[PDB]
Write a protein that binds this DNA or RNA. Structure first.
Ligand SMILES: [Ca+2]
Length: 276
DNA sequence: TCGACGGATCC
DNA sequence: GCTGATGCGC
DNA sequence: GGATCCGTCGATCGCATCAGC
């Protein structure tokens, strides 16, 4: 069936009002997405922090419109070391973070511009574009090694500060996270290896899947639809974009949104509300 | 994602 | 700047 | 032997590069 995001709950389980609004969006081509007026949508949504994945855009080709974006002035970008127009992530923030860093600290996994880490007063924000297992699972073996290094890195981080992980994690955790699970158990993003990796990521860091913690049995909630076969028209999709939270942060969780109607990509944006 | 393919295998 | 082909995706 | 059942296996869209001039 089709899906309507419920309204934004902007008070916490204790009634404290949300102080912090984080939007995450795989823009699948930053320049194409700006040409498709996504930046307008970002302006009307007005996040305190915007995380972008799959920018496919090197630092010096960044369009001018991003400078004229005065509520998200502190901007950080990561592109692959030697693969142009591939991958890429950015982190735009209203307030200046204490410390920004790139990658997870493992040479093998830090060459494709996928991870930005931004340290704030009371939490640490990681945004990531996870490597896709590949058509015909050509990179599924590399991906399990990423999963373990990423798990290890995030666990280390979360031991020092409450952690918010957001972005495209390239896996539908459970069968409820995609429209046709039975046909995709051998396609990238729904292999047993990928769903197990996600489960261990939740278990080992540990982290809670914010959306699923709030809406544990809501089906048809997806963040991605392939461009082909009018899949978004029919809501034949996958939930690949998450906010994963330190359990410490659950009493701060106000809501976790899926902005199904915002166009500009084959991913829609997701928005997180915290009382901090 | 969807389909046309097969090569199975049922009534 | 323009064509045409290739890489990469969930 | 003529219908179904179910595993492949290509071809769909979109962004971006690259080779060449
Ligand atoms: Ca490829």
């Amino acid at each position: 069936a089709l899906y309507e995001d419920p309204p934004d709950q902007k008070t916490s389980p204790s009634g404290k009002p949300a102080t912090l609004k984080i939007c995450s969006w795989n823009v699948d081509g930053l320049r194409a997405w700006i040409k498709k007026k996504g930046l307008d949508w970002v302006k009307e949504e007005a996040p305190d922090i915007l995380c972008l994945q799959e920018t496919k855009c090197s630092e010096n080709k960044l369009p001018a419109e991003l400078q004229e974006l005065p509520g998200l002035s502190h901007q950080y970008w990561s592109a692959p070391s030697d693969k142009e127009g591939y991958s890429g992530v950015g982190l735009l923030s209203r307030q200046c973070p204490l410390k920004v860093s790139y990658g997870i600290g493992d040479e093998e996994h830090d060459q494709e511009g996928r991870v930005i880490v931004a340290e704030f007063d009371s939490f640490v924000l990681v945004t990531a574009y996870v490597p896709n297992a590949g058509r015909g699972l050509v990179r599924l073996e590399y991906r399990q090694r990423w999963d373990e290094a990423f798990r290890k890195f995030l666990k280390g981080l979360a031991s020092r500060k409450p952690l918010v992980l957001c972005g495209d994690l390239n896996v539908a955790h459970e069968e409820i996270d995609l429209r046709n699970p039975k046909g995709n158990k051998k396609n990238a993003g729904f292999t047993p290896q990928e769903c197990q990796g996600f489960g261990e990521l939740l278990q080992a860091v540990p982290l809670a899947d914010s959306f699923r913690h709030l809406y544990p049995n809501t089906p048809y909630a997806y963040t991605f639809w392939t461009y082909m076969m009018n899949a978004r028209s029919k809501n034949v999709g996958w939930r690949l974009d998450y906010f994963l939270l330190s359990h410490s942060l659950l009493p701060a969780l106000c809501d976790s949104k899926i902005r199904s109607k915002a166009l500009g990509s084959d991913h829609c944006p997701i928005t997180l509300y915290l009382a901090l």
